[PDB]
Amino acid sequence: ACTKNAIAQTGFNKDKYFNGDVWYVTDYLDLEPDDVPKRYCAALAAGTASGKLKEALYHYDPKTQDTFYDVSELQVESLGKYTANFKKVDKNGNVKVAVTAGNYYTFTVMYADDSSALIHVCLHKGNKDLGDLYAVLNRNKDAAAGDKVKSAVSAATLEFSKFISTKENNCAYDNDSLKSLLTK
Ligand code: HEM
Ligand SMILES: [N+]
């Protein structure tokens, strides 16, 4: 189960974050021992499509090759805090698993600037018992975490040294699919 009420960034700039561009996960911290492997790659695009706040997701496990995309319409809880009812889709937006009761995530944007972000995610999916996840994002898939985002990790009373990097997984992303999924 999740245990954190993450606090959103003071002065969060939603239009800059939700600009339709891609964010790559560079580092992550899963609070429950084994909800996820020590290497999925992940990326997302977030934006407004025909007036609707949307987020598209990509996951890839470079060892198993397990791959999946999702798209969600987002609902607002407060500035920087959103609820996402996800649908599993192929890379072209064709539905594989419809929106389902019990299938949603919340996320909180704890820190963001033009190039980097720190988010909290609480995923709910069927009968899995999942815990809190934190992720450091960058607009550049190769960027080492800089001082603004690392300081934000500290300010959340977390230790960046505990975060697991995705950089040695050598993941390659279909950015075009993420951006186009925002409309689907
Ligand atoms: C970027 C922020 C992330 C968000 C919003 C997110 C969200 C989600 C969602 C919605 C699902 C279920 C998708 C579906 O069933 O259609 C999922 C599954 C999963 N995610 Fe993430 N995720 C993120 C990052 C990560 C990271 C960095 C990892 C690293 C290991 C990870 C590991 C997993 C795993 C292992 C599953 C499979 C869960 C299961 O079915 O048991 N996710 N995630
Ligand atoms: N996840």
**What string of DSSP letters covers 89-103?**
E-TT--EEE---TT-
| Cα separation, 137 vs 159, whole angstroms | 16
For residue 132, how many C-alpha atoms fall within 13 Å in the half-sphere facing its CB?
13
Domain boundaries, the chain: 1-184
Distances (CA, A) of 54 to 22, 116, 149, 178: 12, 19, 24, 11
Residue 30 near residue 128 (C-beta atoms within 8 A):
no
- What distance separates the 2 farthest-apart alpha carbons in the chain? 40
The answer to whether the beta carbons of residues 1 and 131 sit under 8 Å apart is: yes
CATH code, 1-184: 2.40.128.20
- Ligand with smallest separation from the Cα of 102: 1
User: At which residue do the structure tokens 């815990």 appear?
Assistant: 131
Paired tokens of 126:
């069927």
Q: For ligand 1, is residue 99 a contact (CB within 6 Å)? A: no
Experiment type: X-ray
Amino acid (1-letter code) at residue 166: T
Measuring from atom 1 of ligand 2, which residue has the nearest CA?
123
Tokens 């994002």 found at:
137
Ligand 1 atom, smallest distance to 86 CA: 10
**Cα 2 to the center of its chain, rounded Å:** 16
Which residue type sits at 88?
A: K
* Residue 48 near residue 176 (C-beta atoms within 8 A): no
Ligand 2 neighbours by CB, cut-off 6 Å:
36, 123, 133
Nearest CA to ligand 1 atom 40: 125
The minimum-distance atom of ligand 1 relative to the CA of 28 is: 27
- Residue-level length of the chain: 184
Rounded Cα gap, residues 127 and 143, in angstroms = 35
Q: How many angstroms separate the CA atoms of 29 and 118, rounded?
A: 11
Q: Decide: 130 and 148 in contact? Cβ < 8 Å.
A: no
- Determine the Cα–Cα distance for residues 139 and 162; give it in Å rounded to an integer: 22
Single-letter code of the amino acid located at 38: K
Distance CA 180, CA 134 (A): 26
Q: Which residues contact 27 (CB under 8 A, 6 or more apart)?
A: 135, 136, 145, 160, 163, 164, 165, 166
Per-residue exposure over 42-77, b if at least 16 CB sit within 10 Å of its own CB, e if not: bbbbbbebeeebbbbbbbbbbeeeeebbbbbebeee
Beta-sheet pairing, 67-78 with 81-89: antiparallel
Given in angstroms, what resolution was this structure solved at?
Answer: 1.1
Cα–Cα distance between 79 and 18 in angstroms, integer? 12
Helix residue ranges per DSSP H, the chain? 14-17, 147-155, 175-181
